[model samples]
Target chain A: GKLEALAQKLEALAKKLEALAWKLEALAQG
Target chain B: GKLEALAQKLEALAKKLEALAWKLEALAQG
Candidate 1:
């Protein structure tokens, strides 16, 4: 359960990071 | 454009890592 939660957190983190990265580049270029 | 591509790749990497971590933890627990 703990590990599963960790995995979920990592997935959420990855999603947020990906979104942030996208926005960063978009802001930089646009 | 290049940064966007890099971000995409990193996003992919994050997804893979998340998956791998889940599997590893699953195997460990199951």
Candidate 2:
């Protein structure tokens, strides 16, 4: 149950982190 | 059933996306 909970959490943080990464890619490249 | 498979899938994607984040972080800061 706990692993499942953190799993959901990392999912949340990861998507936001991923969004930041894409914006950084935009700044760095185009 | 699908959880373990997607566990691995999400694990790998998490790794991949993390690398992407670091790459851009370097670009942005440096």
Candidate 3:
């Protein structure tokens, strides 16, 4: 699951990272 | 399928992606 479609996985991960950044910011400010 | 490449499959997918130029290029430019 971690290794399928390496390029696509990386893209999904980059988006998840951006989402995680926003969530962390929200939590930090809350 | 570098993950399970027998050389032939890798070549096939490489050819597939070459045909996918527009889709990939959009990821770059858009």
TM-score between candidate 3 and the true structure: 0.41
Tell me the interface RMSD of model 1, in angstroms.
Answer: 2.9
Write out the backbone clash pairs for model 3: none
Q: Taking candidate 3, what TM-score does its chain B reach relative to the real chain B?
A: 0.51
lDDT of 1 at B1: 76
Q: By TM-score, who's the top model here?
A: 1
The TM-score that candidate 1 achieves is 0.58
Q: Model 3: per-residue lDDT, tens digit, B1-30?
A: 232333434445444654454455455555
Query: TM-score (0 to 1) of chain B, per candidate?
Result: 0.84, 0.75, 0.51
In model 2 chain A, where is the ten-residue run with the lowest total lDDT?
A1-10
Q: Each model's DockQ?
A: 0.40, 0.05, 0.03
lDDT of 2 by residue, B1-30 (tens): 344454555556767765665655555556
Better of 2 and 3 by TM-score: 2
Clash number for candidate 3 = 0
Superposed by TM-score, candidate 3 places the C-alpha of residue B13 at a distance from the truth, in angstroms, of 29
